[PDB]
Amino acid sequence: GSSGSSGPDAPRNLQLSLPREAEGVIVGHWAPPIHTHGLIREYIVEYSRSGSKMWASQRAASNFTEIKNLLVNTLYTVRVAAVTSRGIGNWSDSKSITTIKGSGPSSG
């Protein structure tokens, strides 16, 4: 219900990055869980703007995903969770990453 016991079920080494060829996008990466109740069907990735009660979760075949449709120069919290035949398990150590507005030259 509410209680929670941190376990290996969830992934590790959560490192959020940004595509140098895509704006308002966040590439969340992680590692496989040390162990799992059963065969891992997939990995869900939930994200929400530091200032917004709206979390968006999506399915990811690999150990990473690409969260597009985001605001540049804005703190975004990402979190991955290992899914099993049953359902979603513990949530990985949520991480924060500040987006950027293009990684090009500076002219004005």
Q: What is the SS3 string spanning 6-65? A: CCCCCCEEEEEECCCCCCCCEEEEEECCCCCCCCEEEEEEEEEECCCCCCEEEEECCCEE
Number of domains observed in the structure of the chain: 1
Residue 36 lies in a domain: yes
Q: Please provide the distance, in angstroms rounded to a whole number, between the alpha carbons at the two ends of the chain.
A: 54
Residue 51 lies in a domain: yes
Identity (one letter) of the amino acid at 3?
S
| Upper half-sphere CA count for residue 74 (Cβ side, 13 Å) | 16
Q: How was this structure obtained?
A: NMR
Domain that holds residue 20: 7-100
